[PDB]
Chain A
Amino acid sequence: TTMCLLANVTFPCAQPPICYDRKPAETLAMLSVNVDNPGYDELLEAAVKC
């Protein structure tokens, strides 16, 4: 399993707290810090859709 990061909150990468159709730049900042991640594609395709 793989846990992603926005703060010290290790949320599951398939279940993000935010989506781009709600927030313009907070999703991009969440993707900013999590580039070095093997589950980045999971966080990616989950972080688009609600």
Chain B
Amino acid sequence: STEELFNEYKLTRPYMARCIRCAVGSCHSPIAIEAVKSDGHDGYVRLQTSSQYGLDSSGNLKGRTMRYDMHGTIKEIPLHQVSLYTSRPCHIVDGHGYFLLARCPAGDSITMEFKKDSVRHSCSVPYEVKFNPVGRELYTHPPEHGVEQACQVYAHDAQNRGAYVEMHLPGSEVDSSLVSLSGSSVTVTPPDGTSALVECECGGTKISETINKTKQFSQCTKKEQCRAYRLQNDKWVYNSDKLPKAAGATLKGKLHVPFLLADGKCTVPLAPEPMITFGFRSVSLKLHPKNPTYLITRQLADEPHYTHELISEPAVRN
């Protein structure tokens, strides 16, 4: 029953947003990044991007794809062309809607990039990504063998749960490949099956909504004075701050978010066994930690005198 899950991001389209670090400078990117969440334990993060996943360029379902917005025309590539990295390369697991799930190492940035023919697209964001160990032994890469604590990692399926984001009317995405000059006037050519609207300032205050017609206007000489917007009544976007909004109550629905933080099981390491030397009312502890290990002691009386210590070197505690 995956088609019942995917059917709500069919109402939506990918968009372009402002990314601060692109391949050269500051650009408008089709793969812009809204938020990175890293609160699952063993290295799984969940990116909310400005692209869409698990859908094809039409609206139907293709398996491992990124769907993006390239200056209005929606394009697509396979998922194995898209790579992202924090410090080391991350590994993309799955995608659903505006959301992506990756297995990432710890780092102070996220950079997603894909490669078209001779254009390289990138988007680096200053979003901190952390790695959260489980248990009282602080590893950096999850181990090979040990025991199994309970944990909380981002679930890998796109099951509808009780958490939502809010969708809206896309506003007037302005264009300038529409407006062009005649030999003596200004010419607006809206695309087929799409209505534009034109605001100019060459007479007094001029404004028009045009449909499907190469519609010239007299008294406008230079095309710097006319802005040709674009309109799409269908096809929701996210409530982004990198997009402008429409006029009047703005709201069209809400969608569920995939890959929520669920309870699970995680494998944790097991420290080398301490070597215990006994004496008269005293206990010595030889400790050889492989990776840093909390020692926590307490006494079973009315004053516990608890001791809490991160130990990362070979140490003897009496």
Enumerate chain A interface residues (CB-CB to B < 8 A): 20, 24-25, 27-29, 31-32, 35, 40-41, 44-45, 48-49
B53 within 8 A of A: no
Q: Is the CB of A28 within 8 A of B8?
A: no
B10 within 8 A of A: yes
Q: Is the CB of A28 within 8 A of B251?
A: no
Bound form: Cα–Cα A49–B254 in Å: 17
Which A residues are in CB contact (< 8 Å) with B253?
28, 31-32, 35, 44
Minimal Cβ-Cβ distance residue in A for B4: A45
- A20-B11, A31-B252 provided; 8 other pairs, C-beta below 8 A? A24-B235, A25-B234, A27-B11, A28-B234, A32-B249, A35-B254, A48-B7, A48-B8
Number of B interface residues in the complex (CB < 8 A): 15
Which B residues are in CB contact (< 8 Å) with A27?
11
7 A-B residue pairs with Cβ-Cβ distance under 8 Å, sorted by A, are A27-B11, A28-B236, A28-B252, A29-B252, A32-B252, A45-B4, A45-B7
Mark interface residues in B218-260 (1 if CB within 8 Å of A CB, else 0).
0000000000000001111000000000000101111000000
Q: Is the CB of B7 within 8 A of A25?
A: no
B284 within 8 A of A: no
Which A residues are in CB contact (< 8 Å) with B233?
24-25
B301 to A: closest C-beta gap in Å: 55
